[PDB]
């Protein structure tokens, strides 16, 4: 593409703004930064050569642009870029710029729940195969610092945000993995709003690969997953069978959980697809062991296990740490944070009971403890909530961080919350 000599104006100072920012200039083009922030996290980082302006949107500048890279966490409705986009001002995301520059295949991945997961396996049957792999997106690493000549496949987690703002991308593979209520305050027009962005990811993708048990996945380039059925599926000893024929004793992986034999299916389709090599793409299977902060347990200490799954961060998530989940005493359930607008009240389900305790904390902290207000406590913060409970922790007990919320109202980046349940897990515990 050629940005030469265009006004450029980015929107955002945090990973992505400043990715694209260090994209530009290495192409010879200074672009102008703007967020709505006083101090964003990536000020401080901001080249002295590039203009910014914080504390709100500039209109002028808006309205001065040639092109406008949109960071994923700010909405394209905000009436500044409505109204730049209703002047016919160029929008995209950095996802945008990425495609329009690799020179490899991309597998492209989105959906409610599991992506990060999913993402991070592709990414293991490629390195398992030799092939020198790019994994970047919504995972944490910025799409734009993946590229790279020698790269020869690039994997990305693709947000609903991020996929809004994409136009150009013609993956080899993409998936839904499933869509469930989320990010409501970001679609006003509701979950078939939110349905819409994730999917664009199908547009001129080579190979679909869609959830047989989840009808809002599907978009003939359509593979199937599925617990009974789908091309991609489960029989129950749990086996993973393909079109036919079993590839996988589940027995070999370190996941466990229904949704992880199916993350792992989603996985396998889609390098199936890319063309990996089933061999070492089974045997990736067997050696992953599940990244932090997804359902993790990270103390088993005095007869009681500490659960980090501090991505959690809407209620499919929630549903699926909960549903089936044995303890032998008491649940001790950390909730709270930014609900997003969700209706929360498909959990109460799973609160029944004389054996469960919710600790509720952050800014829907209220709203989570009035599922079943009688076993439930409310704190400001996390911390508050753990120090509470670690004197009710008995032999047998099971302590779960999962909270059903982002942590944006109270906790810095994205990987600060479940840092901190483990390390007051393995203070208190
Ligand atoms: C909110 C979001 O989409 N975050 C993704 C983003 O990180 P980055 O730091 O660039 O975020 P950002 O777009 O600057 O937005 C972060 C926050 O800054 C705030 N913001 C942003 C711009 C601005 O002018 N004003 C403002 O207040 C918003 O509160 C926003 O929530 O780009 C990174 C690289 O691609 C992603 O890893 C990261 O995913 C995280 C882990 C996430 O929470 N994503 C959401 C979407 C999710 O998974 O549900
Ligand atoms: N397919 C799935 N369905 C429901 N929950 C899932 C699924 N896969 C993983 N989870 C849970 O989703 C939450 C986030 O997992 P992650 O792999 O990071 O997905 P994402 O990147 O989409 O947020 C964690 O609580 C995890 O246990
Ligand atoms: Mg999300
Ligand atoms: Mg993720």
Same mark, same amino acid.
């Given at each position: 593409?050629?940005?030469?000599?265009?006004?450029?104006?980015?929107?955002?100072?945090?990973?992505?703004?400043?990715?694209?920012?260090?994209?530009?200039?290495?192409?010879?083009?200074?672009?102008?930064?703007?967020?709505?922030?006083?101090?964003?996290?990536?000020?401080?980082?901001?080249?002295?050569?590039?203009?910014?302006?914080?504390?709100?949107?500039?209109?002028?500048?808006?309205?001065?642009?040639?092109?406008?890279?949109?960071?994923?966490?700010?909405?394209? +409705?905000?009436?500044?870029?409505?109204?730049?986009?209703?002047?016919?001002?160029?929008?995209?995301?950095?996802?945008?710029?990425?495609?329009?520059?690799?020179?490899?295949?991309?597998?492209?991945?989105?959906?409610?729940?599991?992506?990060?997961?999913?993402?991070?396996?592709?990414?293991? =049957?490629?390195?398992? +195969?030799?092939?020198?792999?790019?994994?970047?997106?919504?995972?944490?690493?910025?799409?734009?610092?993946?590229?790279?000549?020698?790269?020869?496949?690039?994997?990305?987690?693709?947000?609903?945000?991020?996929?809004?703002?994409?136009?150009?991308?013609?993956?080899?593979?993409?998936?839904?993995?499933?869509?469930?209520?989320?990010?409501?305050?970001?679609?006003?027009?509701?979950?078939?709003?939110?349905?819409?962005? !994730?999917?664009?990811?199908?547009?001129?993708?080579? /190979?679909?690969?869609?959830?047989?048990?989840?009808?809002?996945?599907?978009?003939?380039?359509?593979?199937?997953?599925?617990?009974?059925?789908?091309?991609?599926?489960?029989?129950?000893?749990?086996?993973?069978?393909? !079109?036919?024929?079993?590839?996988?004793?589940?027995?070999?992986? *370190?996941?466990?959980?229904?949704?992880?034999?199916?993350?792992?299916?989603? +996985?396998?389709?889609?390098?199936?697809?890319? &063309?990996?090599?089933?061999?070492?793409?089974? *045997?990736?299977?067997?050696?992953?062991?599940?990244?932090?902060?997804?359902?993790?347990?990270?103390?088993?200490?005095? #007869?009681?296990?500490?659960?980090?799954?501090? *991505?959690?961060?809407?209620? #499919?998530?929630?549903?699926? +740490?909960?549903?089936?989940?044995?303890?032998?005493?008491?649940?001790?359930?950390?909730?709270?944070?930014?609900?997003?607008?969700?209706?929360?009240?498909?959990?109460?389900?799973?609160?029944?009971?004389?054996?469960?305790?919710?600790?509720?904390? &952050?800014?829907?902290?209220?709203?989570?403890?009035?599922?079943?207000?009688?076993?439930?406590?409310?704190?400001?913060?996390?911390?508050?909530? =753990?120090?509470?409970?670690?004197?009710? /922790?008995?032999? #047998?007990? =099971?302590?779960?961080?999962?909270?059903?919320?982002?942590?944006?109202?109270?906790? *810095?980046?994205?990987?600060?919350? #479940?840092?901190?349940?483990?390390?007051?897990?393995?203070?208190?515990?």
């Amino acid at each position: 593409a050629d940005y030469q000599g265009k006004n450029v104006v980015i929107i955002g100072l945090g990973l992505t703004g400043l990715s694209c920012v260090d994209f530009f200039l290495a192409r010879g083009v200074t672009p102008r930064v703007m967020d709505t922030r006083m101090t964003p996290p990536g000020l401080d980082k901001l080249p002295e050569a590039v203009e910014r302006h914080t504390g709100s949107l500039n209109d002028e500048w808006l309205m001065a642009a040639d092109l406008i890279v949109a960071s994923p966490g700010i909405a394209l +409705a905000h009436p500044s870029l409505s109204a730049a986009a209703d002047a016919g001002i160029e929008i995209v995301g950095d996802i945008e710029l990425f495609c329009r520059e690799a020179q490899a295949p991309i597998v492209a991945i989105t959906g409610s729940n599991g992506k990060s997961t999913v993402t991070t396996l592709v990414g293991e =049957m490629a390195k398992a +195969a030799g092939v020198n792999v790019g994994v970047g997106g919504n995972i944490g690493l910025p799409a734009l610092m993946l590229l790279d000549d020698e790269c020869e496949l690039y994997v990305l987690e693709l947000s609903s945000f991020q996929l809004e703002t994409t136009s150009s991308l013609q993956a080899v593979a993409a998936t839904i993995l499933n869509v469930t209520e989320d990010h409501m305050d970001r679609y006003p027009f509701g979950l078939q709003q939110y349905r819409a962005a !994730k999917l664009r990811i199908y547009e001129n993708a080579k /190979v679909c690969v869609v959830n047989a048990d989840d009808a809002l996945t599907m978009p003939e380039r359509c593979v199937s997953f599925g617990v009974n059925m789908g091309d991609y599926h489960l029989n129950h000893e749990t086996w993973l069978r393909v !079109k036919g024929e079993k590839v996988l004793n589940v027995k070999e992986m *370190k996941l466990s959980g229904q949704h992880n034999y199916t993350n792992a299916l989603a +996985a396998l389709a889609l390098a199936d697809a890319a &063309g990996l090599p089933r061999a070492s793409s089974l *045997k990736a299977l067997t050696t992953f062991t599940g990244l932090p902060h997804r359902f993790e347990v990270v103390l088993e200490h005095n #007869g009681v296990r500490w659960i980090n799954d501090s *991505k959690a961060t809407n209620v #499919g998530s929630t549903e699926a +740490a909960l549903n089936g989940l044995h303890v032998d005493g008491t649940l001790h359930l950390l909730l709270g944070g930014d609900g997003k607008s969700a209706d929360f009240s498909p959990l109460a389900r799973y609160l029944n009971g004389d054996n469960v305790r919710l600790y509720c904390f &952050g800014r829907d902290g209220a709203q989570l403890a009035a599922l079943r207000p009688e076993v439930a406590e409310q704190t400001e913060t996390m911390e508050q909530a =753990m120090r509470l409970l670690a004197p009710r /922790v008995q032999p #047998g007990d =099971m302590v779960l961080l999962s909270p059903a919320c982002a942590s944006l109202d109270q906790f *810095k980046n994205f990987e600060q919350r #479940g840092n901190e349940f483990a390390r007051l897990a393995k203070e208190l515990g």
